Amino acid sequence: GSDASKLSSDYSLPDLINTRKVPNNWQTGEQASLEEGRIVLTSNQNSKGSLWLKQGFDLKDSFTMEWTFRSVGYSGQTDGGISFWFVQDSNIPRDKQLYNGPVNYDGLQLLVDNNGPLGPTLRGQLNDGQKPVDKTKIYDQSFASCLMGYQDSSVPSTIRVTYDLEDDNLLKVQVDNKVCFQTRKVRFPSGSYRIGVTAQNGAVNNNAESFEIFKMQFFNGV
Structure with missing residues (x-):
């Protein structure tokens, strides 16, 4: 289980509640911004935001990532969503075409959205970096x-x-x-992984859904 003794400060985002500047180990992108106690990814109608660790994580052993997030300000189906990433790259990924993150990623995408056939879901998606995923089949x-x-x-x-x-x-x-899901079918290969979160709210109904990050904790072990 998570324990403070296994926390990796280098890959964590301490609780933003009284934080006045984005921690130096993270980089905001697009229109993401630190506001009172949280990083807001989608701060206005049809906005986009990203939040990534500046340094890669060298995958050699077990780990845990805990994201604390919310969505406020809108109820209704939209083509927006929030994605949590664990993907191999030598830099913060450049591509922004999939929920303001990389459409040709190599690794794992966790998507929280409500535009699919089951309504509000958390979904796992995999890609190997060879081709962009087909968004129409996600x-x-x-x-x-x-x-x-x-x-x-x-x-x-x-x-x-x-x-x-x-x-x-x-x-x-x-x-x-x-538990949401579990599997043993994914054996991630070693290398440097990028960890971050991206979101968009799109233009449906001129919504202003606000995807917001409070905290992220990374641990060695599980």
Whole structure:
């Protein structure tokens, strides 16, 4: 389980509640901005924002990523969404075509959105960097998913991603401590991985859905 003794400060975003400047190990992009106690990714109608670690993570052993986020200000189906990334690249990924993150990624995308056939979901997506994914097939191409309500609540959700080399490469996602999905079919190769979060709210109904980050914690182990 997560324990303070296993926390990796270098890959964490300490609770932003009283933070006045974005921590120096992270970089905002597009229109993402630190506001009172949180980083707002989509601060106005049809906006985009990114938040990535400046340094890569060298994958050698088990790890945990916990994201604390919320969506406020809009209820209704939109073509917006928020994506959490774990992808191999030598820099912060340049491409912005998939929820303001890379469409030709090599690694894992976790997408929270409500535009697919099951309504609000958390979905896992994989790509190997050879081709852009087909956005028109994303819901059929999820390797795993769960229902997850997220819109229009000021109480943030916690997505906990664990990758356990000491349990035959178990990749698991929990939401608020409840399992969303797990699999042993993904054996990530070694290299330098980029970790970040991106979001867009699009133009449906001139919505102003606000995707917001409170905290992210990275641990060695699970």
